[PDB]
Ligand SMILES: *[C@H](c1c[nH]c(=O)[nH]c1=O)[C@H](O)[C@H](O)[C@H](O)COP(=O)(O)O
Ligand SMILES: *[C@H](c1c[nH]c(=O)[nH]c1=O)[C@H](O)[C@H](O)[C@H](O)COP(=O)(O)O
Ligand SMILES: *[C@H](c1c[nH]c(=O)[nH]c1=O)[C@H](O)[C@H](O)[C@H](O)COP(=O)(O)O
């Protein structure tokens with residue numbers, strides 16, 4: 001029952017929810033910190049349209065002038081893409097201040113889940129989830145995303161956890177906190193730019209339909225928390241393992257040596273891997289995002305059907 | 308509070324006991340499928356139900372049958388889980404929605420069991436031993452979802468402590484961090500599962516059922532959610548020799564690690580291997596501790612229905 | 615029910631919408647030696663009263679969760695000392711069940727304040743990730759209470775005996791805002807500064823209060839850490855205080871100190887190695903935090 005001075009849902013999205021059309025949420029960190037200009041905004045508007053061509057309704061989420069806004073104008077997206085790193089990356093602990101100081105912010109997966117759940121949106125597409133960082137056994141550097149997944153009822157379609165992270169530790173972590181890690185048509189956990197990895201999802205499902213069904217069962221039996229749907233990047237756009245892993249490993253060593261830490265790590269690694277791959281990691285990431293948007297449209301349609 | 312009959316079904320017996328305020332004791336399915344071999348699996352489970360019956364209390368064995376969460380089971384069902392063994396999905400919280408959605412059978416761990424018991428409003432649950440922090444968890448992050456269920460869900464779990472195959476010190480630390488009281492029953496020293504003693508202490512030591520119940524009531528009436536571990540030492544008669552059992556466990560652990568056994572397979576492999584190495588003795592101790600735990604859990608049950 | 619009692623001076627302010635600031639009893643029983651423990655408690659209360667707000671010291675007396683306390687009960691906690699049960703969240707129901715007395719930690723003080731509707735609470739410094747928690751898993755339940763329960767905790771940062779870096783990672787993970795008051799760098803407790811930074815620098819109590827109402831109205835449960843730099847003149851010498859802390863921790867490890875008794879031991883050991891100066895620094899930072907806390911509580915009461 002939040003006040004409009006706090007949360008503002010755009011009329012497209014409101015109508016969508018009234019008329020029970022399927023809605024897919026999207027995040028703003030990917031635009032501001034995830035990718036450079038103008039690939040971030042092109043990518044974002046285009047993801048929105050992809051969703052539209054699948055017959056669903058996009059709601060991109062962000063903090064515009066201190067307001068939590070569900071659905072955004074082309075203008076505001078252009079805005080986040082131009083202002084870029086100057087915009088505040090917003091996780092859970094960041095949110096109330098960016099709302100109070102009335103500033104603009106780009107929501108992470110955590111925040112995007114929070115707001116989406118506030119708006120009653122169950123399906124959310126992104127590129128890759130945050131997770132347990134390499135070295136975390138000694139650094140305790142662990143995304144708030146995982147705790148959000150533990151606690152907030154949103155399904156997040158992604159290409160897995162970002163492959164710059166520690167995937168093994170991430171899979172243990174998700175199990176401890178009772179979060180389903182669903183492979184869409186895959187048992188092997190997808191690694192972001194790359195289609196497989198040495199690890200496993202917690203369950204393989206071959207259709208949106210079964211995922212929607214699981215969601216309804218899960219929530220109706222009271223098990224609160226979200227679900228991760230790991231969606232492999234299409235073969236056309238997949239980075240070959242050896243190259244990408246070399247660029248990731250170098251970028252991670254460099255970040256260690258340079259004392260990069262905290263909320264700045266992921267943007268640093270993503271950009272540096274893009275430098276190291278000459279733009280290829282970035283192209284692949286954009287491809288992965290469109291793909292997840294498509295699957296996410298199918299899942300939301302299937303979920304709305306049941307609900 | 309009202310869960311659909313398609314998802315959740317309580318036996319008529321357990322329903323009359325709940326209705327008529329008879330003290331009910333919950334029981335887990337995974338003990339049967341993944342914790343013991345056949346016929347000992349089904350045999351022990353039925354003899355446990357009987358044991359709780361002698362105490363003048365009503366057992367509800369919990370499992371997933373044909374996609375339904377089932378509180379209370381028939382002899383046929385217990386037996387089916389028993390003979391089906393590893394063919395039955397081991398079910399933790401992350402697992403739960405998919406077994407139920409897909410109409411399958413599943414054997415519930417402490418976590419799943421607690422979840423379901425809590426749905427039927429059963430506060431007392433007897434098992435052999437709880438999951439915990441695995442040896443090597445500093446680097447592996449392998450930490451049972453049981454401990455998280457304990458953190459949030461209102462059930463008392465009577466056991467011989469954590470399975471001796473785990474890392475007990477880190478478990479005690481973990482429970483403190485998460486606000487879960489670890490109650491030694493008539494001991495300040497943490498019971499070791501197969502062993503009565505460990506070089507680790509419980510958080511509170513209490514000598515009667517009634518105290519345990521009254522502490523339950525203050526805890527919940529006060530709004531601190533989460534369960535309680537009541538660690539009940541195996542009786543002196545059936546205990547394992549420190550030397551022999553420890554050697555068995557250590558070999559088993561080194562072996563599991565060397566073979567690369569990970570995830571939900573770890574515990575069932577280690578129990579099997581330990582039973583093998585001890586020429587079945589460990590198993591016999593396990594059974595005996597389960598009966599003991601059941602008796603104590605019935606007493607706490609009566610004392611709880613009282614207040 | 616009868617399992618929580620609120621002093622009439624406290625309820626009087628709650629009903630009448632006046633600023634209330636919580637305090638913890640572990641500062642007293644296990645935090646500081648007698649007589650300075652009771653003295654510090656009473657004078658902290660006074661500092662609040664004079665600040666324009668109403669002190670409520672939470673503790674468990676005769677099994678009761680008590681909001682606001684008599685000087686008799688304060689002297690009792692200060693004197694009976696380490697003989698009083700230290701109470702965290704796991705501890706709580708039993709100390710109540712058994713009608714015993716206990717000194718509440720930041721965790722339990724947050725709980726109790728929450729039961730009574732007190733959104734603002736002042737302490738010296740919170741528990742956190744201990745040095746070597748990476749191998750020991752030794753992590754205060756406080757961090758979890760901050761993750762979950764809605765209370766603002768004003769302090770000197772985390773007690774500097776702990777592992778602060780790990781503590782900041784952990785706070786991020788669990789979504790708990792770490793607010794530096796007029797500082798980017800995380801207050802180091804005895805020290806005014808640390809190699810670590812907070813999550814946001816806020817310069818005024820009002821800002822913090824608006825952040826509070828916006829945070830909870832939005833439904834994000836969990837508390838807030840407000841880190842208050844120790845006054846410049848009371849700060850310990852970095853070399854002396856860190857040499858002390860380091861030795862004390864090395865000893866604690868050697869001697870098999872663990873669990874709930876780890877922090878009290880180290881504190882006692884540190885003031886001993888610093889010949890009372892760290893305790894003196896400690897008492898000052900507590901007063902300072904009580905002042906900032908009063909301001910926050912007032913500015914927040916104004917706003918909703
Ligand atoms: C990752 C984001 C999603 N997809 C993508 O392609 N690129 C991206 O940068 C998310 O924004 C994620 O929530 C964010 O990285 C959170 O990280 P922290 O652990 O630093 O909060
Ligand atoms: C242990 C269970 C209890 N008693 C017993 O004798 N044998 C057993 O197997 C529990 O089922 C426990 O939850 C199990 O270890 C599952 O834990 P993970 O999810 O960590 O595998
Ligand atoms: C620390 C307390 C706060 N300020 C201060 O000046 N001195 C103190 O002793 C708190 O009591 C803290 O919550 C306590 O350390 C709890 O620790 P554990 O429960 O982690 O042992």
Ligand SMILES: [Mn+2]
Nearest residue numbers: 141142143262
């Ligand atoms: Mn991080």
Ligand SMILES: [Mn+2]
Nearest residue numbers: 449450570571
């Ligand atoms: Mn495990």
Ligand SMILES: [Mn+2]
Nearest residue numbers: 752753754873
């Ligand atoms: Mn501790």
